[PDB]
Design a protein around this nucleic acid. Structure first.
Lengths: 150, 124, 106, 169
RNA sequence: GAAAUUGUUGAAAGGGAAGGGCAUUUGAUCAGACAUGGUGUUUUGUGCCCUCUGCUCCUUGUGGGUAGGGGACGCAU
RNA sequence: GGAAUACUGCCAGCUGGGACUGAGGACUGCGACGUAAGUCAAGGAUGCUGGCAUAAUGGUUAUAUGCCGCCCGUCUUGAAA
RNA sequence: CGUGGAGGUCAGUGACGAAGCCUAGACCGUAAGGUCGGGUCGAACGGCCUCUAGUGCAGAUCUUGGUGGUAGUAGCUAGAUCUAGCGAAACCACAGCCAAGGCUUGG
């Protein structure tokens, strides 16, 4: 609470406002996302909530392929066409703060099982779509991602 | 802070044919030979100094760490920097003894000035 | 799985060059499966990573990487100019450059 | 009159001026604000001036005016200043009243800085009793190295070892 | 105690050349803070704070300097 | 007879992908949307979040590889030798 | 910008190491140049403002000194062309595998 004491230059009025994010057309909650980057790379998870810090939220569900609840940036994810039903799943229980941080916090696990049950029970409504979230994804030979359709 | 510090050309200019001869030294000098290649600027030869390389008046003379340099001898001299600890940093002319350096050191941390070349002549 | 490759593969070719003066700012890249520019347009902007070995273990692993982007198309056959951060060594013309898939915008 | 005393100080030299490697040139006078001898900070050409300065006590605001200009032995007036940063600043912009903005703006700063300086020096008074600096003269070096080398050379160092082992046998 | 020039030891390339320019690579190699706080909030002593009692010099003013008895704003905790 | 389509054009029509730059540094200006207060993509970029002090990164160096460059000075400038 | 000396001034720096020289250390200058870190060394020396010059080097078949290649060569003292010992100079930008365009294109 001193005086500036060594004079500097005050900034100018920055005219760049903060305007909300526009996701691309192919993301609506419940798409199966394939990750690209990170220890979870190339897996297949389920897209639930679009958070406020401009990242998505994804669950494995951790019961299945190993991916827990997680925040994931929009740009590093590939959006398949294969939908599911998220509608019977709760959402708002968590946001940026739930992921703020400073082993495992038993609460986190609890939420994990909560979304786990309902969501898996939804997935069982489609054939093989259980396994299709178990197996990894990878390019095979001759694959030409500029010709592919996800 | 400061802008990002850009040198425009970071490689010291050498005198034409410096290395092929010792009787010629490395301090840049012009080529007055009207036939020479370096004077007429043929492709592939060394690069003359020319004004366009002149750096950015904002960050000119700035040492990398962001301060400038100011060259002090005794403590009574660095007391001129009580005001600017955010712009100038001061270092200790070579001939200072090892007796007085340690004084400029202690007093120079109290003021909170950055001394670029501490550790000169001082062990522990 | 057997094949974990998430990245298209490719070949480094040349630096951009005139007939005489090269310009080793921007490597030129050949991509496997792209025969045509409008195939390129998909790739422009992904992250190329040139990966090789160093016998002196640096960070605890001897595999090193340069990164960089892929900027714009080149030629009608679908060469694609990429610029790394630290330009590719020119030791490698015709060495396998990896083109990852992300930033992903479709 | 003063502008002349300036221009003399701006062509001939002051006893005190520095000319740092970049273009700008300090003023090492004990009494000035900002420490740059330029038209408005060089205490020698102003005739109306005010700074702040430590006594080893607290920080006396020194002031001068035109009237004692000819009576240097006592020219600078002096005031002490409180230990309330707030009250201080109020004292400073108190005494300075219609003194132009320069000296309020800057004097305040010199106060802030010297106060901070004090606080630091107070911290550092309490710290790191350990590992003082030390110099070593050159011939101290030379002497140590050589005498050591000869020390080792003198001790053939195995004859001791073996002879000690024959001892142990 | 310099250079030219030479010896030794090590590095490195070479078998057809050295030297320079733009750029990275690899190897070696070196540098790389006595940074260690800030804003508060509380507990508690001390004193330049409070209250008594003075003394002093002079630019006599919205000033300095200084002493003793006590008590609870800066400092320490 | 009746539409359409290409061709050249127009738009102060919409929208996706990539790249490079962020110069300036209280306010003043021109404005647009606003019931108005205010707002804003209107006189040059900001926010968020990651990695680091046995630091992060940065350099010097000897080599490597790619392309380019031949021996300097003077003197008749012209096989410019 | 730099060099030699002078008139001021830093109450400049200095046996706790001034100059100087080395530097595969750093920073600054667009550059002339500058400033620090190690190392060796031993006694003076520097910055600002001004004066004055015997003041800045690649050259001159330059001057003086030191060195080389030429080469242990051509050669001349003991030994039987050989050996040992001793030992020059002229000249020296550099370096000389091809072929056609006269670096380039081939081998």
């Amino acid at each position: 609470k001193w005086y500036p004491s060594e004079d500097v230059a005050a900034l100018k009025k920055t005219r760049k406002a903060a305007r909300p994010q526009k996701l691309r057309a192919s993301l609506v909650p419940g798409t199966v996302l394939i990750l690209l980057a990170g220890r979870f790379r190339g897996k297949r998870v389920v897209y639930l909530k679009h958070l406020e810090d401009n990242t998505l939220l994804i669950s494995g569900p951790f019961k299945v392929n190993g991916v827990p609840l997680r925040r994931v940036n929009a740009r590093y994810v590939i959006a398949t066409s294969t939908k599911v039903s998220v509608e019977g799943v709760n959402v708002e229980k968590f946001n940026v703060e739930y992921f703020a941080k400073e082993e495992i916090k038993a609460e986190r696990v609890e939420d994990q099982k909560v979304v786990d049950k309902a969501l898996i029970a939804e997935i069982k409504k489609t054939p093989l779509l259980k396994q299709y979230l178990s197996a990894s994804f990878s390019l095979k030979n001759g694959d030409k991602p500029h010709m592919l359709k996800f | 802070p400061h802008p990002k510090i850009v040198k425009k050309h970071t490689k010291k200019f050498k005198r034409h044919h410096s290395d092929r001869y010792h009787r010629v030294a490395e301090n840049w000098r012009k080529q007055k030979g009207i036939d020479s290649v370096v004077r007429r600027r043929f492709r592939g030869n060394i690069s003359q100094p020319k004004i366009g390389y002149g750096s950015n008046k904002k960050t000119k003379f700035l040492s990398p760490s962001g301060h400038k340099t100011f060259l002090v001898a005794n403590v009574k001299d660095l007391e001129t920097l009580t005001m600017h600890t955010k712009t100038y940093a001061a270092e200790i002319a070579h001939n200072i003894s090892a007796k007085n350096r340690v004084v400029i050191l202690a007093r120079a941390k109290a003021l909170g000035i950055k001394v670029t070349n501490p550790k000169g002549r001082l062990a522990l | 799985a057997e094949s974990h490759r998430l990245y298209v593969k490719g070949k480094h070719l040349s630096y951009q060059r005139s007939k005489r003066v090269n310009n080793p700012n921007v490597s030129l890249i050949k991509i496997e499966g792209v025969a045509t520019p409008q195939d390129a347009q998909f790739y422009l902007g992904k992250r190329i990573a040139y990966v090789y070995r160093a016998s002196k273990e640096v960070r605890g692993s001897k595999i090193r990487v340069m990164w960089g982007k892929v900027t714009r198309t080149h030629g009608n056959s679908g060469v694609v100019r990429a610029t790394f951060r630290n330009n590719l060594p020119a030791k490698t013309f015709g060495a396998s450059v990896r083109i990852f898939l992300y930033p992903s915008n479709i | 009159s003063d502008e002349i005393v300036w221009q003399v100080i701006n062509q001939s030299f002051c006893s005190h001026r520095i000319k740092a490697p970049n273009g700008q040139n300090f003023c090492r006078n004990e009494y000035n604000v900002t420490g740059l001898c330029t038209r408005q900070s060089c205490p020698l050409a102003n005739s109306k001036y005010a700074t702040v300065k430590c006594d080893n006590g607290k920080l006396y605001l020194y002031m001068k005016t035109p009237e004692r200009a000819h009576t240097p032995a006592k020219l600078w007036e002096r005031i002490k200043l409180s230990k309330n940063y707030t009250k201080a600043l109020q004292q400073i912009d108190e005494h300075l009243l219609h003194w132009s903005k320069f000296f309020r703006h800057k004097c305040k700063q010199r106060f802030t800085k010297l106060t901070q300086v004090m606080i630091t020096e107070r911290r550092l008074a309490l710290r790191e009793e350990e590992r003082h600096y030390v110099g070593v003269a050159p011939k101290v070096k030379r002497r140590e190295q050589n005498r050591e080398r000869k020390a080792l050379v003198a001790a053939k160092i195995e004859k001791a070892i073996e002879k000690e082992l024959m001892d142990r046998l």
